[PDB]
Amino acid sequence: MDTSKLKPNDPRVKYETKQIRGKTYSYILGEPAGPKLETVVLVHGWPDMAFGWRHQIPYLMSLGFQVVAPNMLGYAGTDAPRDLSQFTLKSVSADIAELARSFVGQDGQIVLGGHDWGGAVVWRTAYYHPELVKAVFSVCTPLHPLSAEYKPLEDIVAAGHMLNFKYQLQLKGPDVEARIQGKDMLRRFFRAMFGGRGPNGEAGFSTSDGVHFDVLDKIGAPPLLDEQELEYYVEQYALQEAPELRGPLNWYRTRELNAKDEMDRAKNGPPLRFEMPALFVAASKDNALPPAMSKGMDAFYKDLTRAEVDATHWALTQAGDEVNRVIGEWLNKALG
Numbered sequence: 001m002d003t004s005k006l007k008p009n010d011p012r013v014k015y016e017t018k019q020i021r022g023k024t025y026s027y028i029l030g031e032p033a034g035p036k037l038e039t040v041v042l043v044h045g046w047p048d049m050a051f052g053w054r055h056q057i058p059y060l061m062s063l064g065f066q067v068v069a070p071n072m073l074g075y076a077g078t079d080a081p082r083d084l085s086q087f088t089l090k091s092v093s094a095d096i097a098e099l100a101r102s103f104v105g106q107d108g109q110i111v112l113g114g115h116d117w118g119g120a121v122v123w124r125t126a127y128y129h130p131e132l133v134k135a136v137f138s139v140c141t142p143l144h145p146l147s148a149e150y151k152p153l154e155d156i157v158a159a160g161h162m163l164n165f166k167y168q169l170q171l172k173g174p175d176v177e178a179r180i181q182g183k184d185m186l187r188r189f190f191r192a193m194f195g196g197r198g199p200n201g202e203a204g205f206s207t208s209d210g211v212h213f214d215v216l217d218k219i220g221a222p223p224l225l226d227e228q229e230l231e232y233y234v235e236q237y238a239l240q241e242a243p244e245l246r247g248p249l250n251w252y253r254t255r256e257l258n259a260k261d262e263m264d265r266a267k268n269g270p271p272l273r274f275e276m277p278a279l280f281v282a283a284s285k286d287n288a289l290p291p292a293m294s295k296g297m298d299a300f301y302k303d304l305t306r307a308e309v310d311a312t313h314w315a316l317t318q319a320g321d322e323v324n325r326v327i328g329e330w331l332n333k334a335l336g
């Protein structure tokens, strides 16, 4: 089979929905070349969608894997509940567990991979559902420990800490949700988020201040999406009810809910400990998720493989071939 990246509306895969824990979940389903060896579930982040795995999906199919890549809660053809408790890592992990078992059966196991917010999801899924997850990998996103405390991000950055996360204040508030509505604004947003620049090279997004709305009308073509890829992101995001970014931005509105879930697990529940094979792929030039942030993470794993790829945040695509071979070689070791 052709292993080149999925194009928009690619015919090598199926596009389906299933009811999952009270929500319509849409996903990409790729069937294996040859006998099915494993099922791989792939979890994207923000502001991405299942199509963000376009380089990995046909590659994994060619190796004999069934691939299920959902549009996560809030995104594209998937429901965007009003209730923020649906957007917690624990609830979305349970969604993933039910969706995965709808393919492999309740007794089955999966390989689970994530990027960005999806990487945070898959570490929690392997923690909440060890019965299900045979092997787990994350691109860019390292492990964070179980939250023992909750402090508003406002106070954290006001104290001079976690300043590379300050854009999340803007994302969780009203401004992006209110201003980025409709296809034409979504297109400008995606030009910014995938590397487009203004007439004098100004960025459309920063980790300090978030989306730079005044740059958006003059932002040029993104280097990390071709024109039809850009338009597919616009079209798919436009499936959401106005305001279209409510669902995706709800992921930044769960800090307190997630903390409450995990302060519990951190006192009664089992410790964070991954006995199954795990892979962490860092990205050299990710300024939100720099490799240095993964420093103390190996102690939580019996069997963690580390890799680094020379790419920005959008490593699945910009370094797609290298990421593919890191994953494929690790799976050779992890599954056999």
Ligand SMILES: O=C(N[C@H]1CC[C@H](Oc2ccc(C(=O)O)cc2)CC1)N[C@]12C[C@H]3C[C@H](C[C@H](C3)C1)C2
Pocket (backbone or CB within 6 Å): 045, 046, 047, 116, 117, 118, 120, 141, 192, 193, 194, 195, 196, 205, 288, 289, 312, 313, 314
């Ligand atoms: O915020 C998160 N991703 C955004 C994705 C888009 C990027 O913006 C970019 C990136 C690159 C470019 C470019 O190449 O030009 C432009 C804009 C900024 C960060 N990810 C999380 C994932 C987990 C959970 C929570 C906290 C922490 C760890 C990071 C969210």
